[PDB]
Ligand binder design. Structure first.
Ligand SMILES: Nc1ncnc2c1ncn2[C@@H]1O[C@H](COP(=O)(O)OP(=O)(O)OP(=O)(O)O)[C@@H](O)[C@H]1O
Ligand SMILES: Nc1ncnc2c1ncn2[C@@H]1O[C@H](COP(=O)(O)OP(=O)(O)OP(=O)(O)O)[C@@H](O)[C@H]1O
Lengths: 256, 95, 263, 256, 263
């Protein structure tokens, strides 16, 4: 019954392991703004945001083309492909831009954030900064958090826009429908305050759980650089269980 | 206010980077009318020394004209340990 | 004379570890107060206890009478302006320039004009001997030059309590012989108080003023290096010379060998 | 025109960077089998396969439930939800089991493989093994490759099965359709040799590109453990550009 | 006497790094042939050139007449059974047991029965003094005990050319004083040929038989340690003692300071 105790003692640790991480989050946002933090923040958004822009643009196409391929192959025998502009749009607006752009963001900037803080604990820059009294939560962590909350909804919008344009490319330029019909049905079904703004509220509360779980495992990792690499693959599991799990609920709600 | 007249500049008190910049300002404004350089530098009434107290002196030398602008005396030997540590004993002058 | 730090009877133990069960130290002014120990002790943790970065549990860390867990948050930031430390491997920020490393504790502490803040860095970079920099990064700095900038950040403003976590990392005997003379001179010139935690005996006693030695929870001897070797137990005496006679195991077990078999 | 030269010399390096990696691949598979490699291999499949099993099972549900939620919300106004058993199945069989199970596999075992080999180069076990002459390509790499080719098609099958069962759960137990029309509307439409076996041929040639790009960046990384963590996020970008890009080039072949 | 290794006139340079531009060495039998250098040289790369793990470009590495880039693939594996090396930090496989570490070069080399393969490990683990193991892992081994097992792995079966990449890592003076006596004894008992690349002068000359010294591409002196200090250029003489006089820069620049300004 001893391996039972090992499993029992492991998930007891994972619960406490959460209760630390919530206390670190409330200690960040409930603080006065540091002097000249904006110049730190904009450089941080240049690291997390602008670097990840290429890998989501060209991944914006290949999700769009397969939606523009199976979306055509399904709709031809039913004949009613006045829904091609609507069955490219409503999936890409409601689910695949919140979901798939999260699992690609947890990949690049979700995991490169927990390395950069994982490297800073080991060489003890974070320890040396504390003895000068600059308290590295406000110095290193907090611009690396606010460049993740802001920069993900600025990405799913760029994901959903290049996705829909991609569905129009292989649709009407290589297979052929009535572009008019397309645009028509497209704008004649998709509300703005019900669909797009609900497509961003999902992409904010994904950006919180995908970064706060990421910036935590870099801070509360250990040294001994098998201790970095066990943590950079501890986020990417723990993000994708909480991206998709938190999607369901949200969707069901904003879509009774 | 602790940098006096009589063609000489006397430094008293302590230099501790809150009362060190208006010491640099008020020393600078005295310099702007002290042309042709007959002036002597006094620093005998310091009670503490650091590289900070040294650093304002070279800025006073840097604002003035040519290399041997200020002339130095009453150096209180806490400076003198520092000056050879940054290796300056001919780079600024003395007796 | 008067003590900088009174370490008195702490038991900062880490769960299983018992480390520093009951110990008490005296760090007085103007004097090199070296500390030797075995690897896997709390020696570089002990400096954080002096620094108050780590928190003690039962003892008291007296920075000139005042304990460093009793002062308020605005005194703590004022107290750290007398003490700056060295991180074993050197702790440089690999994003800010080397001009931005050494100017950083000034801007983190005080507001001055730029013609003075750029002035103090050009002096403290010369006092280590690396002055033609302030342009290149912490990258493309050789590891020998790496600690010297970290030394300059350790003498940023002008503290009077700098702790060294192994200045002699195992570098060249050049850079070892460089930092031998760098350490005394600054202590002479600026009247500091240094502690060196090293395992490098022929350099350590020849340069220190006092050597406490921590093994696991106890002082095994102290004094100047002359009355270390006089009053030496044959556990600390063998720690000095590294002989295989004493209470250290060179053999892992004690058995006739010809008892069990080979599977 | 100098930043032009920096961009120009960067992608010149990336081409050569590929031509090394192809030579490492042909040097692995064209070799005699090592003595007792099977006992190494089965322990390796324990590491890559069995560990990743949990994160794809519970991620198998949440893809299934949202397909069982939007698949119901779309099909109710058209009324003809005899396609619910077919529009859960044909997407999950053709695209989302090859695609989404790759981006979750590149996450966990795609990136934990390039760390384990990234750690072995730095401590020079791989260098010490060469001086004994055991040539670590056949010792460390080759069981860590064949436990990735075999173990991914054994996962998408487990992904697609728990996905379809998940669509049946919120479909007929919480919303309610004919339990007869689900499978009888399913089993008739979904051929085996045209759909499932084509749903595995895509999941083999994803397992090759997702592991051979992963096991390469661990081997040909550098030391200095900012050299591990720059490489563990060099696969997860380079996998997901080549998962989705090779998907769309494939689905036009089998479903033109 | 007869040379194990003739290093002769290689220029194994790394792209821009012209490391080892033209050098030539002699390693003869039965003798401790130490090598000192500055950090950031190719010293631990030089051992791979002797080992043939790295490949030379212009020279020749003569293992008893035969060059180690000319032999066939079935001779290369036979040639490595005379030489085993130590990787600076110790190279243990952290998945196989400590019984499986030391038995591994035997099973990688030869087939024997289990009552003999389990027998040689229980002897070579006693020759380092760590015998009550073979059950625990390379984990929970203290760093002091870590290189020992490595030592065994080295003197695994029974080679006659072991290369040491810094045995004195900067450990305790205990473990430093332990491995001082471990090195000679095995060379006495098993008639080996060792090379030690270290920066630890008061241990190095007191234990070596011959010291070549590589700075950047050149021998700055050789012989026994007596005629190193006699015929010493004031570049290698200052390398021995670490004085700040010689052609090493302690000052980074020579600018008359008083020239530019502070921005
Ligand atoms: N945050 C922590 N607080 C206290 N102990 C820790 C912590 N993290 C790890 N430890 C354990 O305590 C020991 C810390 O000792 P550490 O190595 O820091 O001191 P040291 O041996 O003096 O270091 P140095 O190599 O600088 O001499 C380690 O053995 C480690 O197992
Ligand atoms: N694969 C390689 N081959 C040759 N040179 C390399 C390689 N990788 C890196 N280098 C460069 O060459 C140098 C390698 O020297 P290395 O540090 O291995 O020898 P060393 O300084 O003698 O090491 P030690 O710390 O063991 O004394 C490094 O400065 C590095 O910049």
């Amino acid at each position: 019954m001893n391996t039972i105790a090992w499993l029992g003692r492991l998930v007891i640790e994972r619960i406490r392991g959460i209760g630390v991480a919530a206390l670190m989050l409330l200690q960040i946002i409930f603080s006065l703004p540091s002097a000249g933090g904006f110049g730190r923040f904009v450089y941080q958004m240049h690291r997390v945001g602008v670097m990840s822009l290429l890998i989501i643009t060209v991944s914006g196409l290949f999700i769009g083309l397969v939606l523009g391929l199976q979306g055509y192959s399904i709709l031809v025998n039913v004949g009613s492909e006045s829904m091609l502009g609507t069955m490219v749009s409503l999936t890409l607006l409601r689910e695949l831009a919140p979901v798939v752009a999260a699992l690609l963001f947890a990949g690049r900037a979700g995991s490169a954030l927990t390395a950069e803080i994982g490297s800073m604990k080991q060489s003890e820059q974070l320890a040396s900064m504390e003895m000068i009294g600059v308290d590295p939560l406000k110095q290193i962590v907090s611009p690396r958090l606010w460049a993740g909350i802001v920069s993900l909804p600025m990405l799913t919008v760029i994901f959903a826009a290049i996705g829909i344009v991609g569905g129009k490319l292989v649709g009407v330029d290589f297979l052929g429908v009535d572009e008019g019909s397309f645009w028509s049905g497209m704008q004649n079904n998709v509300q703005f305050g019900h669909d797009v703004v609900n497509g961003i509220i999902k992409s904010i509360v994904f950006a919180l759980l995908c970064t706060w779980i990421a910036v935590f495992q870099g801070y509360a990792c250990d040294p001994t650089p098998e201790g970095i690499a066990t943590a950079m693959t501890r986020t990417v599991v723990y993000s994708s269980l909480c991206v998709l799990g938190f999607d369901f609920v949200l969707t069901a709600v904003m879509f009774g | 206010v602790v940098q006096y007249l009589n063609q000489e500049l006397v430094v008293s008190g302590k230099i501790d980077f809150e009362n060190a910049e208006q010491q640099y300002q008020a020393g600078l404004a005295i310099i702007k009318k002290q042309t042709s350089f007959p002036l002597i530098v006094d620093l005998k009434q310091l009670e503490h020394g650091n590289t900070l107290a040294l650093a304002v002196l070279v800025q006073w030398l840097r604002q003035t004209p040519q290399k041997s602008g200020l002339h130095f005396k009453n150096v209180p030997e806490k400076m003198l340990k520092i000056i050879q540590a940054c290796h300056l004993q001919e780079d600024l002058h003395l007796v | 004379t008067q003590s900088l730090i009174e370490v008195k009877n702490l038991s900062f133990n880490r769960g299983e570890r018992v480390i520093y069960d009951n110990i008490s130290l005296n760090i007085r002014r103007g004097q090199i107060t070296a500390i030797m120990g075995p690897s896997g002790t709390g020696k570089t943790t002990l400096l954080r206890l002096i620094g108050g970065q780590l928190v003690p549990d039962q003892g008291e860390v007296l920075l000139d009478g005042k304990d460093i867990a009793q002062m308020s948050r605005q005194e703590l930031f004022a107290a750290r302006a007398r003490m700056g430390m060295l991180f074993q491997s050197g702790a440089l920020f690999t994003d800010m320039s080397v001009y931005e490393n050494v100017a950083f504790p000034i801007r983190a502490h005080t507001k001055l004009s730029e013609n003075l803040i750029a002035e103090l860095v050009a002096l403290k970079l010369e006092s280590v001997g690396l002055r033609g920099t302030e342009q290149l990064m912490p990258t493309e700095l050789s590891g020998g030059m790496n600690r010297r900038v970290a030394l300059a950040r350790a003498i940023a403003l002008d503290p009077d309590l700098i702790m060294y976590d192994e200045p002699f990392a195992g570098q060249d005997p050049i850079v070892k012989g460089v930092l031998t003379r760098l350490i005394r001179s600054l202590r002479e010139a600026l009247d500091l108080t240094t502690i060196i935690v090293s395992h490098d005996v022929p350099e350590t006693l020849s340069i220190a003023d006092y050597i406490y030695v921590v093994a696991e929870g106890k002082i095994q001897g102290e004094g100047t290096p002359e009355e270390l070797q006089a009053y030496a137990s044959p556990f600390v005496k063998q720690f000095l010379t590294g002989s295989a006679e004493g209470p250290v195991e060179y053999q892992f077990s004690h058995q006739a060998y010809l008892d069990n078999e080979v599977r």
